[PDB]
């Protein structure tokens, strides 16, 4: 159930631009949604928001709220896809605030330093958080509330949801799943279009369609290859996915995905 009005009144797939993209984060691709995430804290924002207690936090909540409003605007006729994008952005905001977001950008680098300086000036003696990880733990509920408020303002939706444990899932795994939610859907649809055209002049239709299908396949196959590198490199440290292939991970462990052996494994894993 959505936050009250009281609470609410107070508020493509890019291979480059990743920290350590040739090393630890080799193979990581940035979701378009992440590339576009609405959140930026400049020196000037810090300078002015720090003058009133709660204002720096409020500025962050406003960004989270606006990100969610934007996402619902984009996914206006699909509540599920809207809510999942919101969860993903929520989680990324979490990594940004905690200073371990993978994007190589100023906001990803500077947000934590700005936040923690504001926490130092106000929370030196009152037992409130002095570091960003503790802050996230105590305030993520507020962040989500702002997103739910923001989500509601798009089209007066009265249907909110929780975020489960999305912020506790390693960022690269979330981004891979998100890629999964787009591609397995494309894969299902493109298979059906192919079958309907080629196996229901209709010959020029089939060749044309088969051409476009191969192109879609090449693009995703390249992306599939890169992310598999990162997944296979990193799965060792997670006891509960270490024996899974990247196919099996998306098929079995991604409830938002709708990936199957037919639309994923047989298509990209040869
Ligand atoms: Cl197609
Ligand atoms: Cl995990």
Q: Where are the domains of the chain?
A: 1-270
Residue 147 and residue 86 in contact, taking contact as beta carbons nearer than 8 Å: yes
80 is in an annotated binding site: yes
Tokens linked to 128: 């409130």
Which neighbouring-strand residues pair with 103? 18
What is the 56 CA–ligand 1 centroid distance (Å)? Answer: 47
Ligand nearest to the CA of 235: 2
Give me the count of residues in the chain. Answer: 270
What is the 240 CA–ligand 2 centroid distance (Å)? Answer: 7
182 is in an annotated binding site: yes
Q: How far apart are CA 235 and CA 81, in angstroms?
A: 27
83 is in an annotated binding site: yes
Burial of 208 (0-12, 13-18, 19+ CB in 10 A): exposed
Residue 216 and residue 190 in contact, taking contact as beta carbons nearer than 8 Å: yes
Ligand nearest to the CA of 198: 1
Please, which experimental method was used? X-ray
What is the 216 CA–ligand 1 centroid distance (Å)? Answer: 7
Q: How far apart are CA 74 and CA 81, in angstroms?
A: 10
Distances (CA, A) of 141 to 1, 138, 145: 14, 7, 6
What is the 5 CA–ligand 1 centroid distance (Å)? Answer: 46
Tokens linked to 74: 């984009």
Q: How far apart are CA 266 and CA 270, in angstroms?
A: 6
Q: How far apart are CA 249 and CA 242, in angstroms?
A: 10
Residue 259 and residue 180 in contact, taking contact as beta carbons nearer than 8 Å: yes
Backbone angles phi, psi at 128, to 5 degrees: -85, 160
201 is in an annotated binding site: no
Tokens linked to 99: 């200073």
145 is in an annotated binding site: yes
Q: How far apart are CA 268 and CA 270, in angstroms?
A: 6
Which neighbouring-strand residues pair with 14? 30
Q: How far apart are CA 209 and CA 152, in angstroms?
A: 40
Using H for helix, E for strand and C for coil, what is the string for the chain?
CCCCHHHHHCCCCECCCECCCCCCCCCCCECHHHHCCCCCCCHHHHHHHCCCCCHHHHHHHHHHHHHHHHHHHHCCCCHHHHHHHHHHHHHHHHHHHCCCCCECCHHHHHHHHHHHHHHHHHCCCCCCCCCHHHHHHHHHHHHHHHHHHHHHHHHCCCCCCCCCCHHHCCHHHHHHHHHHHHHHHHHHHHHHHHHHHHCCCHHHHHHHHHHHHHHHHHHHHHHHHHHHHHHHHHHHHCCCCCCCCHHHHHHHCCCCCCCCHHHHHHHHCC
Nearest Cα neighbor of 7 from 123, 148, 129, 116 is: 148
Residue 251 and residue 261 in contact, taking contact as beta carbons nearer than 8 Å: yes
Q: How far apart are CA 245 and CA 228, in angstroms?
A: 8
Distances (CA, A) of 128 to 97, 98, 110, 123: 16, 16, 21, 5
């Amino acid at each position: 159930k959505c936050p009250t009005e009281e609470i609410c009144k107070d508020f493509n797939w890019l291979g480059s631009s990743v920290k350590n993209f040739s090393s630890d984060n080799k193979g990581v691709l940035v979701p378009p949604r992440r590339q576009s995430l609405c959140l930026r804290i400049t020196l000037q924002d810090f300078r002015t928001k720090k003058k009133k207690e709660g204002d720096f936090e409020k500025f962050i909540y406003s960004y989270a709220s606006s990100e969610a409003r934007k996402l619902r605007t984009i996914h206006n006729n699909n509540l599920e896809k809207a809510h999942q994008a919101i969860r993903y952005s929520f989680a990324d905001i979490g990594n940004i605030i905690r200073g371990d977001d993978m994007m190589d950008t100023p906001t990803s680098k500077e947000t934590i330093t700005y936040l923690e300086k504001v926490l130092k000036i106000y929370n030196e003696n009152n037992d409130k958080p002095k570091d960003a990880k503790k802050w996230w733990t105590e305030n993520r509920h507020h962040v989500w509330e702002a997103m739910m408020c923001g989500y509601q303002s798009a089209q007066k939706d009265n249907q909110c949801t929780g975020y489960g444990n999305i912020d506790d899932i390693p960022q690269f795994l979330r981004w891979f799943r998100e890629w999964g939610t787009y591609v397995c859907e494309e894969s299902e649809k493109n298979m059906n279009t192919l079958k309907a055209v080629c196996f229901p002049h209709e010959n020029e239709m089939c060749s044309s369609t088969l051409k476009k299908y191969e192109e879609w396949y090449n693009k995703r196959k390249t992306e599939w290859t890169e992310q598999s590198i990162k997944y296979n490199n990193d799965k060792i440290n997670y006891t509960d996915i270490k024996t899974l292939s990247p196919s099996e991970y998306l098929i079995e462990k991604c409830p938002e995905c709708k990936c199957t052996k037919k639309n994923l494994q047989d298509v990209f894993e040869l």
